[PDB]
């Protein structure tokens, strides 16, 4: 399998002043790279395009807001004087040719600005098992996975079964749920289950794991609080199952 | 001039099976290209289409769009709606020197539940959480989950699973407090639920 379009880093926690570089790089043989930042409230918007190593062509963002492009094709961003506003999806995109082929994006750095790092905490996450009633009335067994308390929304959950990574009786919330919706600092909650059969969760061999990566701060924030400094870290929950 | 794209309708949710229509409209007919993107949650975006200011329309799979220059306008067809069509729906052009992106249609494609079987069930705590978990699951796809009346009940969407080698789909809510007066009888009495849902003895 070819490689897509990569960004470095995925996440990124900053305060208000502070700068960051983002890099991209292309799909092999794209030559044509650009950046785009979203927002929940003004939604796409075009920061700039690199081809050949040179700027082709540009949006209206301020000027610190600037780019790059080296000889192999890799594109960097860098944004000085960090607002909260600033908190996006930054996207790169690479292309062929960007009048005429089509744009190919990665998945974006997710880059949360905040006013203080003692806003940032890790999920707890926890597994209740499934109801009786449930597994009586219908042969299937609903595990909930609850990761709770988290800020910034930068978690990826995940179900794995003995051992492998399943999606077959997954669903997860798209969207997290704001614990106090009225403030720009809430900590958030996202749920998940995980439904198999009575007689898979009948089986105490089997195994069942909610893991929640979540992404915080670096090994070169300062931290001056009490509890534990909340650094990148996976914050898991289990279950086994059982006979009766 | 500047340029505004405008895309209708902002959310739709359809039954599985039936075709879709997604609008895009451009003031400045001065483009070199417009494309056409879907978005998943937690993902960035993929290209579905790429119609060029020459060209009138392009078709892959189930999608046809076309554009009409002149008027200022594209139009995206789905046909035949599937669960895995669901996702924000991007109209992007290319003007002279610019790029410029619609806000979206987000498009969710609605499981047809064949054996509905409504029922709220209570999950057993954590001996490591101080939560208490109620499932409102297996409901038809037009039941509408609602938020509690209280701020410290939590109440999640629906959400589609597919348990695959049972040709099995199920739609699910999830609702928890650490609150003590708080029960899974009424957790989600703020919710239209269905007559006849099952609310096993606790």
């Known amino acids: 399998m070819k490689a897509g379009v990569t960004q470095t880093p995925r996440y990124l926690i900053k305060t208000r002043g502070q700068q960051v570089t983002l890099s991209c790089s292309p799909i092999?043989?794209?030559?044509?790279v650009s950046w785009y930042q979203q927002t929940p409230g003004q939604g796409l918007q075009f920061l700039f395009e690199?081809?050949?190593?040179?700027?082709?062509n540009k949006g209206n963002f301020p000027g610190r807001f600037s780019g790059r492009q080296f000889s192999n094709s890799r594109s960097e961003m860098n944004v000085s004087t960090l607002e909260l506003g600033d908190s996006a999806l930054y996207l790169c995109?690479?292309?062929?040719?960007?009048?005429?082929?089509?744009?190919?994006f990665g998945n974006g750095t997710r880059l949360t600005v905040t006013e203080d790092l003692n806003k940032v905490f890790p999920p707890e996450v926890a597994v209740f098992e499934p109801s009786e009633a449930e597994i009586s009335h219908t042969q299937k067994a609903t595990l909930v996975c609850l990761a709770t308390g988290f800020f910034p929304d930068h978690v990826e959950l995940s179900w794995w079964v003995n051992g492998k990574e399943v999606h077959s009786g997954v669903c997860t919330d798209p969207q997290p749920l704001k614990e106090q919706p009225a403030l720009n600092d809430s900590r958030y909650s996202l749920s998940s289950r995980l439904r198999v059969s009575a007689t898979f969760w009948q089986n105490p061999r089997n195994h069942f794991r909610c893991q929640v990566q979540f992404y915080g701060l670096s090994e070169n924030d300062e931290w001056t609080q009490d509890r534990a400094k909340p650094v990148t870290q996976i914050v898991s929950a289990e279950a086994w199952g059982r006979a009766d | 001039m500047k340029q505004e794209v405008t895309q209708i309708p902002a959310a739709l949710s359809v039954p599985e099976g039936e075709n879709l229509v997604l609008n895009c409209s451009f003031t400045?007919?001065?483009?070199?290209?417009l494309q056409w993107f879907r978005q998943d949650p937690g993902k960035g975006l993929t290209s579905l289409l790429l119609?060029?200011?020459?060209?009138r329309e392009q078709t892959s799979g189930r999608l046809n769009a076309s554009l009409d220059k002149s008027s200022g306008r594209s139009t995206l067809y789905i046909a035949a709606s599937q669960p895995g069509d669901s996702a924000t729906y991007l109209c992007?052009?290319?003007?002279?020197?610019?790029?410029?992106f619609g806000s979206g249609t987000k498009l969710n494609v609605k499981p047809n539940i064949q054996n509905p079987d409504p029922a709220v069930y209570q999950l057993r705590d954590s001996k490591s959480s101080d939560k208490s978990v109620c499932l409102f699951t297996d409901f038809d796809s037009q039941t509408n989950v609602s938020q509690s009346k209280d701020s410290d009940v939590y109440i999640t969407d629906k959400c589609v699973l597919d348990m695959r080698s049972m040709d099995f789909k199920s739609n699910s809510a999830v609702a928890w407090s650490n609150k003590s007066d708080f029960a899974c009888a009424n957790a989600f009495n703020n919710s239209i639920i269905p007559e006849d849902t099952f609310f096993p003895s606790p």
């Open positions: 995109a690479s292309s062929f040719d960007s009048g005429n082929s089509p744009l190919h």
């Open positions: 092999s043989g794209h030559r044509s």
């Open positions: 690199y081809f050949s190593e040179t700027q082709r």
């Open positions: 400045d007919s001065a483009i070199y290209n």
């Open positions: 119609i060029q200011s020459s060209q």
């Open positions: 992007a052009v290319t003007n002279f020197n610019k790029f410029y």
